């Protein structure tokens, strides 16, 4: 049972920055393409970022691009998401997701259908 | 006399094996076209190909010599057409499982392609015959890979149209099999046949094990944001390397009576040392060159084995002996995959897997290198 734990969320005035962490457990962290999704209050879960298992690639959503810096620390089985210059439109419950197949990127699995094993999300309330 | 059967057989082989859509199967199925998840594709669809292949290999090798082969090649053509029609217009998971069943039929029926020619040709054309048939398939694979790469990037070719091109290719191939001439009307006693089948059974299991992790090794060794282009190109070149190695087997005048085993030992070590080079070396080019040598060297041997099995077969049991060897390789590969890669087993990372594959191939060479008692 792959267990993930999102932490870092909370109220942040507009323009500040955040860092969320997701200390994955129960899986071989060093083989899986992790990602970050969000669920705005009234929409469906939407891809935010995805860091390949090698760490050399980081896809991003069009809105977030240029502010979000997904990372990973295979020593601590942890991934991060630095969110800088946060606008009220980034509010969501931020879920970290793990690739359902280990080497998703190498086998060329579409990213927006590759991440499951959801967590319980962390609430970010970017308060203008 | 021998030219017409060989020409038609190799035209069928080239046009059947030329399929642009193959290298983009996972992107196609998980893409915006079919929307199959990674978990589904990996666990529910793909395994049906291995079990379907394993089961269907039984009737194939049981009967292909009875039906006189052509019926089996035609069946493979129809299976190709059905598989690609379902791929184009089939949506769902059960439909993809049926696609995998028919692809298992397609690949399991390939025993007739290599078995067929020795029944219609004289024994004195067996060497040349064997080389062309293997090379045209690898030449076709390289051509399909290059065409797909160019089209997808230069022509912005969507995977649907790659599938359409592959469907037209396999349809043309099916049309080429209706004209194949019909042949006319416990066999491992020979030691050459026994050992050539022993290497076939074990080398083949190892070979198909590496192919699913070469690109994973290259990514781990050298994380590059454009690895996909290089991973495809090296695959194609490595496939073209074995096409000329396979071709060169039928052309060069070498006495295979004495050079049979000697080639087996020499190129068995090159298949071992080549794998250690990919595991240890840091340069990706050294790893790329290792794959080129390993794949080209293996395809040189698989050509000699088929030629050297057919020469020593007293009975016309070409599909039985070839069919058994690719079935026992399937059992070995499936067992080994569970032990080595599967979570149920050891769950070895790709970092060390090629030390297992490298040494697994050194053991094969060890048995053949040490058969000299005095
Ligand atoms: C796959 O998802 C996309 C976006 O939701 C959709 O437009 C497409 O129709 C889906 N696949 C098919 C062809 O059913």
SS (H, E, C) B173-214: HHHHHCCCCCCCCCCCCCHHHHHHHHHHHHHHHHHHHHCCCH
Collapsed DSSP state (helix, strand, coil) of residue A81: strand
Of A56, A109, A113, the CB nearest to B223: A56
Residues in chain A: 128
Q: Does A45 touch chain B (CB under 8 A)?
A: no
One domain for residues B369 and B258: yes
Instruction: Find out whether the beta carbon of B37 lies less than 6 Å from any atom of ligand 1.
Output: no
One domain for residues B162 and B14: yes
CA–CA distance from B162 to each of B19, B38, B104 (Å)?
8, 21, 21
The residue contributing the CA closest to ligand 1 atom 13 is: B33
Interface residues from chain B to A (CB-CB < 8 Å): 24, 26-27, 30-32, 35-39, 41-42, 215-216, 219-220, 223-225, 227-228, 231, 347, 349
One domain for residues B181 and B322: no
One domain for residues B192 and B179: no
Nearest C-alpha neighbor of B238 from the set B260, B207, B279 = B207
- Give the domain ranges of chain A: 6-127
Identify the burial level of B346 via C-beta atoms within 10 angstroms of its C-beta, where 0-12 means exposed, 13-18 middle and 19 or more buried: middle
Which token pair is B33?
């076209």
CB contact under 8 A, B30 and A110: yes
Ligand 1: centre distance to CA B34 (Å):
7
One domain for residues B214 and B333: yes
CB contact under 8 A, B219 and A107: no
The answer for residues whose C-beta is within 8 angstroms of residue B256's C-beta and 6 or more apart is: B127, B304, B307, B308, B311
One domain for residues B84 and B114: yes
Instruction: Find out whether the beta carbon of B32 lies less than 6 Å from any atom of ligand 1.
Output: yes
Give me the DSSP letters along B301-361: HHHHHHHHHHHT-SSS-HHHHHHHHHHHHHHHHHHHHHHHTSTTTT---HHHHHHHHHHHH
CATH number at residue B38: 1.20.1250.20
Ligand 1 atom with the shortest distance to the CA of B33? 13
- Candidates B24, B30, B348: best to mutate against A (most CBs of A within 10 A) is B30
CB contact under 8 A, B219 and A103: yes
Query: Fold for domain A6-127?
Result: Immunoglobulin-like (2.60.40)
Cross-strand bridge partners of residue A64:
none
Domain boundary pick from B162, B185, B208? B185
Ligand 1: centre distance to CA B31 (Å):
8
Which domain does B234 fall in, by range? 186-374
Give me the DSSP letters along B228-249: HHHHHHHHHHHHHHHHHHHHHH
What is the total count of domains within chain B?
2
One domain for residues B178 and B298: no
One domain for residues B234 and B364: yes
* Ligand 1 mutation target, pool B28, B30, B32, most atoms within 8 A of CB: B32
One domain for residues B141 and B230: no
Instruction: Find out whether the beta carbon of B35 lies less than 6 Å from any atom of ligand 1.
Output: yes
Query: How far is the C-alpha of B144 from the C-alpha of B243, rounded, in Å?
Result: 14
Of A30, A31, A100, the CB nearest to B38: A100
* End-to-end Cα separation, chain B, in angstroms: 47
Under 8 Å between Cβ of B276 and B156 = no
The answer for residues whose C-beta is within 8 angstroms of residue B96's C-beta and 6 or more apart is: B29, B34, B36, B41, B45, B90
Q: Are strands A11-13 and A122-127 parallel, antiparallel or unpaired?
A: parallel
Ligand 1: centre distance to CA B298 (Å):
42
What H or E segment, with its residue span, contains residue A60?
strand A58-60
One domain for residues B171 and B302: no
Domain boundary pick from B131, B154, B185? B185
Domain boundary pick from B127, B153, B185? B185
One domain for residues B350 and B207: yes
One domain for residues B205 and B160: no
The residue contributing the CA closest to ligand 1 atom 8 is: B32
Indicate the resolution in Å. Answer: 3.1
């Amino acid at each position: 049972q792959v267990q993930l734990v999102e932490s870092g969320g909370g109220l942040v005035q507009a323009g500040d920055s955040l860092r969320l962490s997701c200390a994955a457990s129960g899986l071989t962290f060093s083989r899986y393409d992790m990602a970050w999704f969000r669920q705005a209050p009234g929409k469906e879960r939407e891809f935010v970022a995805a860091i390949t298992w090698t760490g050399s690639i980081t896809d991003y959503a069009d809105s977030v691009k240029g502010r979000f810096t997904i990372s990973r620390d295979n020593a601590k089985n942890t991934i991060y998401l630095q969110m800088n210059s946060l606008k009220p439109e980034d509010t969501a419950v931020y879920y970290c997701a793990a690739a359902q197949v280990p080497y998703g990127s190498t086998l060329k699995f579409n990213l927006r259908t590759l991440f499951g094993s959801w967590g319980q999300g962390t609430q970010v309330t970017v308060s203008s | 006399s021998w030219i017409y059967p060989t020409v038609i057989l190799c035209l069928f082989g080239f046009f059947s094996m030329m399929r642009p859509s193959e290298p983009f199967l996972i992107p196609y199925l998980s893409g915006p076209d079919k929307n199959l998840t990674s978990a589904e594709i990996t666990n529910e669809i793909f395994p049906v190909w291995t079990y379907s292949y394993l089961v269907l290999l039984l009737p194939v090798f049981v009967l292909t010599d009875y039906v006189r082969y052509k019926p089996v090649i035609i069946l493979q053509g129809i299976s190709f057409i059905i598989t690609w029609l379902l791929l184009l217009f089939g949506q769902g998971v059960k439909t993809m499982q049926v696609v995998e069943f028919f692809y298992g039929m397609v690949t399991a029926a390939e025993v007739a392609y290599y078995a067929y020619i020795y029944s219609v040709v004289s024994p004195e054309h067996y060497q040349r015959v064997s080389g062309y048939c293997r090379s045209v398939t690898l030449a076709a694979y390289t051509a399909g890979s290059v065409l797909a790469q160019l089209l997808v990037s230069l022509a912005n070719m969507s995977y649907f149209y790659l599938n359409v091109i592959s469907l037209a290719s396999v349809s043309v191939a099916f049309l080429f099999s209706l004209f194949l001439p019909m042949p006319k009307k416990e066999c491992y006693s020979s030691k050459r046949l026994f050992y050539w089948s022993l290497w076939w059974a074990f080398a083949t299991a190892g070979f198909n094990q590496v192919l699913n992790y070469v690109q994973i090794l290259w990514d781990y060794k050298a994380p590059s944001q454009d690895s996909s282009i290089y991973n495809g190109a090296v695959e194609a070149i490595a496939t073209f390397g074995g096409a000329v190695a396979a071709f060169a087997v039928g052309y060069v005048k070498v006495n295979w009576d004495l050079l049979g085993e000697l080639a087996l030992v020499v190129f068995s070590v090159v298949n071992a040392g080549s794998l250690f080079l990919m595991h240890y070396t840091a340069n990706i080019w050294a790893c790329y060159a290792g794959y080129l040598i390993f794949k080209s060297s293996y395809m040189l041997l698989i050509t000699i084995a088929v030629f050297q099995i057919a020469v020593n077969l007293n009975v016309e049991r070409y599909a039985l002996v070839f069919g058994i060897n690719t079935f026992i390789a399937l059992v070995i590969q499936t067992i080994m995959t569970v032990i080595v890669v599967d979570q149920r087993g050891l769950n070895l990372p790709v970092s060390i897997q090629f030390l297992v594959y490298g040494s697994y191939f050194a053991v094969i060479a060890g048995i053949f290198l040490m058969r000299s008692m005095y």
